[PDB]
Write a protein that binds this ligand. Structure first.
Ligand SMILES: OC[C@H]1O[C@@H](O[C@@H]2[C@@H](O)[C@H](O)O[C@H](CO)[C@H]2O)[C@H](O)[C@@H](O)[C@H]1O
Ligand SMILES: OC[C@H]1O[C@@H](O[C@@H]2[C@@H](O)[C@H](O)O[C@H](CO)[C@H]2O)[C@H](O)[C@@H](O)[C@H]1O
Ligand SMILES: [Ca+2]
Ligand SMILES: [Ca+2]
Lengths: 228, 228
C-alpha cells in the first residue's frame, strides 16, 4: 500500500487466528539536558527523524501487550526541569512507576471500526502525539515487523505550544476491517497529557474507551491485505 | 520524478534561454515568544510542516534574485532573547538590515556541476538548514511554480543542538546538467550561521564559491526534464 496519508485508508483482513485485545506499547527514556542548560528540556523530540530512528538510541524501559480501554491521561507535575515519578493508567498494563515528566512512548496495532462511514478522530497532547493510520501509512497488513520503520507522512499530529496542541483526522472506514495504527508520544518536561477519541456519522456518541476497537494481529508469512 | 531522496538524483536540461546567475531568495520574519516566556525563542521552526506551509504565515521581508558566490555566514549576536540587527553577506543581494538573530530564509534554483562523479556536500547551521536536491525531491524541472510546495524527504539537514549540527549529502552528478535545489534556513535566537560547501572525486579542492554553479531557470510550458 502507498505510504501517503488518505481520507480512504486501506485496511486488513485477518485469518482465523483470533485477534488479541489491545495495542502493543514500547516505553523509552527521554533525558533532560545537563544541569544549567537553557532551556532544561531537550529539543530532540522535534528532530524530524526522532519518531523513526532517534528514539531507538534511548533506554528501553518496557515492551507490553494488551493496551486497551481508555488510554487518555493527564499527569500533573509539581516542578519544572525535574524528572518526577508517576504511573500510566491501568489501561496501559504497566504497573511500575516511570518518569512521567520525561519519556517517549510508541503504541501500535489495529483499529477495528464498529460502523461503516466517516470517523473523526480528535487528538491532543503534551508534548507530542504523532498518528499514522492505514495500511502502508502506518505499516503493512500482518507484516508489521518488515515495515514498522517505513511509516509515511502523519495523518494527524499535535504539538504542545503550537497555535493549538489539537488535531483531527477524518477518514471513511469499513466496519470489521482492521486498520494499522501507530501512535508516537513524548513528554519533554513537566505535565504530560494524551487524548485520543473519536466520533462517527452514525450517532453523537464520543468514544473514549477502545476495548472493542484496538487489536493486535500476528504477522504471517503471506500478510493479510484487505479483501473487501 | 519521484520525490524521494537518492544517491543518483535526476536533473534538468534547459533550452536556449541563458540561465541566470544565482539562486532566488525569500526572507521571512521569525518572532520571539511573548516577553517572559521560557524559553524566549519560539519552537515553531521545528514543527514538521514549518518548512512547507508554516513559514508562509510569517511577515514576508524580501524576495530577491541572483544569490551566488560564497553564501556562508556567521552572525555574532551580543544578547539572548533579543532581536538584533545585522546584514547578510553581499552574495545575498540584499542591502538592508534585518533581525539576523531571528529570521527564516528560503533559497531555490539549480546546481550545475563542473565535473561528472560523486559530490559530497557538507552543511552546518545555527539553527536549522534543510536541503532538498534533485528533480522531484526539490521541485520539477522548469516547473517550479507548480511543484514548489511538494518537495520530498530531506537529502540532508542540520539542526543546532543535535548530537552534531552537521550533515553530508553524497550524490553522483553529471557535468552541465542543472539539478533542482532548495535550502531552508532558520535562526531562532542569538548567533546565526550557515555553511554550505562541497568536494568531488576529481581533486581535493573544497568549493565554497558557487559563482559557476548556482543558476535560475525560467519555468516553461512543457518543462525541461533531463535528457541525458
Ligand atoms: O504548562 C505545560 C507545559 O509546561 C512546560 O514546563 C514549564 C517550565 O518550562 C517552566 O519553567 O515552568 C512552568 C511551570 O511554572 C512549566 O509550565 C513544559 O515544558 C511543557 O512540556 C508543558 O508540559
Ligand atoms: O550558542 C549558540 C546558540 O545560542 C543560543 O542562545 C543562548 C541563549 O538561549 C542563552 O540564554 O544565552 C546564551 C548566551 O549566554 C545563548 O548561547 C540560541 O538559542 C541558539 O539558537 C544558538 O544560536
Ligand atoms: Ca510536557
Ligand atoms: Ca541561533
Amino acid at each position: 500500500a502507498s505510504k501517503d496519508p488518505t481520507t480512504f485508508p486501506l485496511g486488513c483482513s485477518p485469518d482465523i487466528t483470533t485477534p488479541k485485545k489491545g495495542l502493543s506499547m514500547e516505553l523509552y527514556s527521554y533525558d533532560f539536558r545537563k544541569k544549567g542548560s537553557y532551556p532544561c528540556w531537550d529539543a530532540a523530540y522535534l528532530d524530524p527523524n526522532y519518531p523513526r530512528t532517534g528514539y531507538k538510541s534511548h533506554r528501553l524501559l518496557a515492551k507490553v501487550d494488551g493496551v486497551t480501554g481508555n488510554i487518555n491521561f493527564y499527569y500533573h507535575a509539581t516542578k519544572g526541569c525535574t524528572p518526577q515519578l508517576g504511573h500510566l493508567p491501568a489501561s496501559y498494563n504497566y504497573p511500575k512507576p516511570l518518569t512521567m515528566t520525561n519519556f517517549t512512548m510508541l503504541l501500535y496495532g489495529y483499529f477495528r471500526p464498529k460502523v461503516t462511514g466517516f470517523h473523526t478522530f480528535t487528538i491532543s497532547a503534551d508534548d507530542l502525539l504523532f498518528v499514522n493510520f492505514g495500511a502502508g501509512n502506518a505499516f503493512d497488513c500482518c507484516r508489521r515487523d518488515s515495515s514498522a520503520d517505513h511509516f509515511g507522512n502523519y495523518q494527524a499530529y499535535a504539538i504542545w505550544g503550537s497555535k493549538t496542541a489539537k488535531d483531527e483526522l477524518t477518514v471513511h472506514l469499513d466496519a470489521g476491517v482492521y486498520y494499522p495504527i501507530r501512535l508516537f508520544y513524548n513528554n519533554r518536561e513537566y505535565d504530560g497529557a494524551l487524548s485520543f477519541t473519536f466520533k462517527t456519522e452514525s450517532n453523537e456518541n464520543t468514544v473514549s474507551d477502545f476495548s472493542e476497537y484496538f487489536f493486535s494481529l500476528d504477522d504471517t508469512e503471506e500478510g493479510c491485505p484487505g479483501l473487501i
